[PDB]
């Protein structure tokens, strides 16, 4: 509708840090009573803006959207409005649409919020139902007791959550690791994004090279920018409207030459490595101008051989640092043996022409007039974190930063540009060998599963072969039960635990709804989101920032790290009432009555003298920070690692890792990696060898992940009531397929369903579909390829498109323009 | 009492003057709120005049306000600050960007009569406004 | 006007420690049309005020179709003859059993611990027979 309520002056008025994407976009959450409201002088409201006329431009980000009604545990009832920070330096005052939806997307009886989980779930047999906390947590822990005492820890598996933001942070992430990994003590757990217990960033970890080594003012300070693998319009929407397009549009050059007085610093420049042509793309030629973007349109899993060209001609040229490679450096004359490619070899793989790829090399690695290198920061996502081959990428891309010294420089960095926010404060995890978990589960190993904080249904890879195994041992389960007539607790744990003997899996999902994953738990448990809990985290550029709690909670619903410790009690007390004290001491240190307790235990506790082991982002200064000492920094929080403190400074942080040339390995140097090319793995190859079309997937701007909220929100419905898949064109007339028909994808491991969008900037055999969506479920089509250390090829799989029908209802509301702005 | 907004009701022109495709600017509900009327050529839902095709909406960009450009070939209004895109022919319906409220609709009334096309009503909320009506 | 709100009065009830245990106090808001009723329950309840969070107020009117509810003290309810809907007084005006879409509004007071006083100053549901709760 036409109005909003103001904030009075005098609202409450707390931090609150974006709960989606690696940004970290500092907010402000007003609160207030129902029955108040602001006047619209400046000085009468919250906000300080003049509503008694019209607003100029970029005065003010407010919607209806950023605003709500909550209903709080006494039946009282607050305005709350959930507006971004001017002063915050991540976002000055920019909010992404998908940030911008917040308030929304906060607990309220009637709105998007609704179908929130607010007490225990219990599949019966063959009903729904709610139960009690402690019912549940007598069959969960019980379950988990009884695997333990006959199976030990290998009977229990866990898929978690080990990122930040909502769902994740520092408190989460610890809480849950303290009990999977040192109360449980289990091996069997995967992580929310991937299926095993591993990383994203092993190759350049393994070089010394951690992957957020820099600030975003780095991206203000660069002459050349690479997003590899990397949509950042879209997928790290702020970073790239505040940092990047600052810099392409000049307003960062005189900061650049008052740091460095003798330094030539020419127009910014930005190149692209992606097969497809995206709406950052576009973005880029709109505001620098085609002259200043190379698109560097690889074959898809082709990363390898372009970064190993490239470095091959830097070397050539000489257009490297020998006295930093000499310096602070090992292994660079191997990596330029293994390593070795002509332009002419790199273009026939790559399809990129080799004036191109000079030009790259020009822009990028050549000396400035001045006699310094170029500062070029190269930022790198998806594309290739689950691209051909995780680990070479990775060896090959970081050989070429390291030789041409753009780490530890300022406007540089070979960086991960982020997915959720980081929040990482974990015990080491117990095994000495990566799991492939869901093949695991697909050939029937474990008793009980529990998705914590993700939904493998909808983004596993090889994701039909997974949802498939699931629901047939979730069903032997649901059929053990049903013969149950008027059992104790104790008696219904051991008949589960019988089905399980007999290929059955015990599911649990821990998650603010529902979802998908309803149709295989016997059990739900409901959390709490930022703002219903304090909740710390940091961004992209390492910068902590803590969320402040505003509002309860929907119903007995909890924050997860308070349900790890509800956990861990409850297996204690079972141990000591069977007489095991040695047993109940492995589940001692869960004494936690808010989630500040979780903070206190872990990230105040690295490093720190009489601590377990912990590994935490924080580092061993993050006993520095505390909940109070966040609140007085504001959004800005601070850059980790914290330096120093006190009560004059506040916290002091690190802008810039390895500004000093001392790396993380034994020696203190960056380690250069041979990077082979081997093309694309024979399973990915069998699918391309068999299937018309490369199956591309990955983020749409508006969609947020698996949709969670976005399914109950009716404007987003309607624009994307089905996961779309943009196809070229000609392609779509040779299969009588325009606008909002919908089609089979598949290929040998699975069939999924999208509705075709025509895109013109799509080439020929190519499509993109978005991923983890909650109406089409793309990772269907993914295949069962990961590398070295259990890094799936998401981005790599091929399938065929089977026309099903026109879907009229899509045609009469769903708009199938052009995506790419020009 | 009264729960709706008081609009002004203001004449922006006969139907029969409109071109296909051809953007009419007006203000509506006052002189500092820019709208735009366009002839479509082809009904859509809600569309008003004797096609059914007249549209009409707010140009101001409902992320932060920067005021819109209507585009004749893609029929669109393309928002310069951070790229949002709205479709005219999807009643604001955003393509892409960053804004959470589709562009606010000016509802026409129209009259056989007289063939009058009168602004009537806002449905949505206009930039950098506690209420359509100041 | 910009406002979204209605502008309730502030109106004085009482001081709190006046309130007998389940002893209804009868007053008017928010005018001398619109019967209602500030009870000390006895108990803690959720949005409860006073010393001992307890006191909590209704309009007495029945959002059915408008009889004057009477306050039965030995169930702590609200008991309508019109239909026979009834309400609880300690679970914000649900109602048990009855006709009406809507709970029984509650009037919202402030409890000032310098004073002692208990101020109307709102209604959280809309009384009976009425478009806005100001008229
Ligand atoms: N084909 C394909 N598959 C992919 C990818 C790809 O590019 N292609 N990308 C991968 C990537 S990068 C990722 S990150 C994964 C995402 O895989 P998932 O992690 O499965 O998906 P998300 O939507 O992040 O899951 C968050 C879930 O937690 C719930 N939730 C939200 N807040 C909380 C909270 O505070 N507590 C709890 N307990 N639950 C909460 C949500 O409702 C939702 O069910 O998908 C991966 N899968
Ligand atoms: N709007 C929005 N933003 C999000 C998210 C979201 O769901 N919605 N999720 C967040 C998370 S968890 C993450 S992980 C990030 C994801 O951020 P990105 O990785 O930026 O997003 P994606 O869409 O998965 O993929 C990036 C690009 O990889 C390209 N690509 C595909 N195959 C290849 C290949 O072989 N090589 C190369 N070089 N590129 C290839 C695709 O064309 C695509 O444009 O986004 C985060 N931000
Ligand atoms: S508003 Fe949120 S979605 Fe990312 S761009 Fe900013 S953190
Ligand atoms: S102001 Fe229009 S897209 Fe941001
Ligand atoms: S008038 Fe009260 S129950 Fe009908
Ligand atoms: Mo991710
Ligand atoms: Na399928």
Request: glycine share 10%; charged share 20%; hydrophobic share 35%.
């Amino acid at each position: 509708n036409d109005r909003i309520t103001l904030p009075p002056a005098n609202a409450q008025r707390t931090n609150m840090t974006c709960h989606f994407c690696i940004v970290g976009c500092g907010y402000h959450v007003y609160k207030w009573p129902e029955l108040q409201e602001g006047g619209r002088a400046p000085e009468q409201n919250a906000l300080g803006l003049d509503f008694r006329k019209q607003l100029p431009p970029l005065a003010v980000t407010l919607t209806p959207a950023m605003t709500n009604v909550v209903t709080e545990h006494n039946g009282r009832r607050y305005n709350i409005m959930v507006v971004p920070d001017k002063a915050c330096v991540v976002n000055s005052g920019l909010s992404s649409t998908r940030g911008g939806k917040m308030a929304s997307y906060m607990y309220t009886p009637t709105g998007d919020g609704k179908q929130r989980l607010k007490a225990p779930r219990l599949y019966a047999a063959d009903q729904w139902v709610d139960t009690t906390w402690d019912h549940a947590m007598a069959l969960y822990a019980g379950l988990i007791k009884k695997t333990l005492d006959k199976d030990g820890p290998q009977g229990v598996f866990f898929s978690c959550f080990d990122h930040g933001g909502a769902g994740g942070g520092f408190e989460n992430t610890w809480g849950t690791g303290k009990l999977m990994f040192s109360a449980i003590q289990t091996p069997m757990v995967r992580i929310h994004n991937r299926p095993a217990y591993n990383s994203e960033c092993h190759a350049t970890r393994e070089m010394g090279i951690g992957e957020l080594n820099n600030a975003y003012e780095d991206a203000q300070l660069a002459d050349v920018i690479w997003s590899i693998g990397n949509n950042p319009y879209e997928s790290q929407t702020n970073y790239f409207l505040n940092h990047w397009l600052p810099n392409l549009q000049g307003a960062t050059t005189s900061k650049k030459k008052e740091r460095f007085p003798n330094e030539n610093f020419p127009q910014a420049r930005i190149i692209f490595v992606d097969p497809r042509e995206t709406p950052s793309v576009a973005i880029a030629r709109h505001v620098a101008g085609n002259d200043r973007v190379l698109h560097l349109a690889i074959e898809p899993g082709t990363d390898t051989a372009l970064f190993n060209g490239l470095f091959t001609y830097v070397v050539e040229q000489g257009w490297i640092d020998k006295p930093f490679i000499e310096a602070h450096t090992k292994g660079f004359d191997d990596a330029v043996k293994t390593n070795r490619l002509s332009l002419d070899e790199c273009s026939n793989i790559t399809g990129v022409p080799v004036d191109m790829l000079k030009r790259a090399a020009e822009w990028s690695y050549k000396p400035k007039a001045s006699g310094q290198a170029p500062r070029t920061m190269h930022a790198y996502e998806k594309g290739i974190i689950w691209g051909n081959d995780n680990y070479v990428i990775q060896s090959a891309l970081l050989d070429l930063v390291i030789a041409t010294h753009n780490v530890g420089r300022r406007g540089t960095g070979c960086v991960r540009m982020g997915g959720h926010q980081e929040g990482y404060t974990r015990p080491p995890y117990p095994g000495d060998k990566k799991i492939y978990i869901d093949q695991e589960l697909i050939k029937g190993k474990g008793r009980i599963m529990t998705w914590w904080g993700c939904n493998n249904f909808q983004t596993s890879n090889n994701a039909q072969a997974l949802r498939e195994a699931i629901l047939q041992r979730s069903a032997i389960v649901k059929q053990a039960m049903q013969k149950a007539r008027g059992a104790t607790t104790e008696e219904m744990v051991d008949v589960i635990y019988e089905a399980t003997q007999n290929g059955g899996l015990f599911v649990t999902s821990i998650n603010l709804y529902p979802t998908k994953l309803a149709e295989a738990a016997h059990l739900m448990l409901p959390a709490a989101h930022p703002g219903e809990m304090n909740l710390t985290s940091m961004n992209g550029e390492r910068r902590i920032r803590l969320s402040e709690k505003f509002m309860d909670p929907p119903g007995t619903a909890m924050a997860d790290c308070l349900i790890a410790a509800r956990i861990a009690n409850a297996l204690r007390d079972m141990y000591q009432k069977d007489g095991k004290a040695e047993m109940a001491a492995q589940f001692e240190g869960f004494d936690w009555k808010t989630e500040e307790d979780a903070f206190n235990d872990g990230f105040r506790r690295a490093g720190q003298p009489g601590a377990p082991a912990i590994d935490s982002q924080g580092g061993s200064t993050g006993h520095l920070v505390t909940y109070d000492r966040l609140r007085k920094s504001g959004n800005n929080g601070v850059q980790l690692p914290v330096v120093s403190w006190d009560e004059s400074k506040g916290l002091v942080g690190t802008e810039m890792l390895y500004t000093e040339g001392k790396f993380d390995t034994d020696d203190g140097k960056a380690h250069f990696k041979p990077a082979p090319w081997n093309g694309l793995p024979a399973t990915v190859q069998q699918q391309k060898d068999k299937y018309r079309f490369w199956l591309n997937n990955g983020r749409n701007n508006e969609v947020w992940q698996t949709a969670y909220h976005d399914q109950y929100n009716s404007l987003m419905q309607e624009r994307y009531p089905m996961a779309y898949i943009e196809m070229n064109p000609d392609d779509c007339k040779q299969l009588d397929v325009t606008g909002g028909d919908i089609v089979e994808v598949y290929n040998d491991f699975g069939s999924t369903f999208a509705m075709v969008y025509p895109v013109a900037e799509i080439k020929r055999g190519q499509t993109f579909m978005l991923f983890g969506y909650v109406n089409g479920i793309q990772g269907d089509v993914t295949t069962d390829w990961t590398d070295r250390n259990i890094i799936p090829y998401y981005k790599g799989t091929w399938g065929d498109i089977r026309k099903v029908g026109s879907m009229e209802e899509f045609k009469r509301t769903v708009s199938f323009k052009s995506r790419r702005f020009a | 009492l009264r729960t709706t907004l008081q609009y002004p009701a203001t004449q922006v022109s006969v139907a029969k003057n409109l071109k296909a495709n051809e953007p009419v600017s007006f203000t509506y509900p006052d002189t500092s709120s820019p709208c735009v009327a366009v002839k479509l050529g082809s009904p859509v839902p809600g569309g008003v005049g004797p096609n059914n095709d007249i549209v009409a909406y707010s140009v101001l960009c409902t992320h932060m306000g920067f005021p819109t450009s209507y585009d004749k070939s893609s029929k669109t209004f393309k928002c310069p600050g951070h790229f949002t895109e709205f479709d005219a022919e999807k009643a604001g319906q955003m393509i892409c960007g960053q804004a959470t409220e589709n562009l606010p609709r000016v509802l026409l009334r129209y009259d056989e009569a007289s063939d009058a096309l009168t602004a009537v009503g806002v449905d949505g909320l206009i930039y950098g406004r506690q209420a359509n009506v100041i």
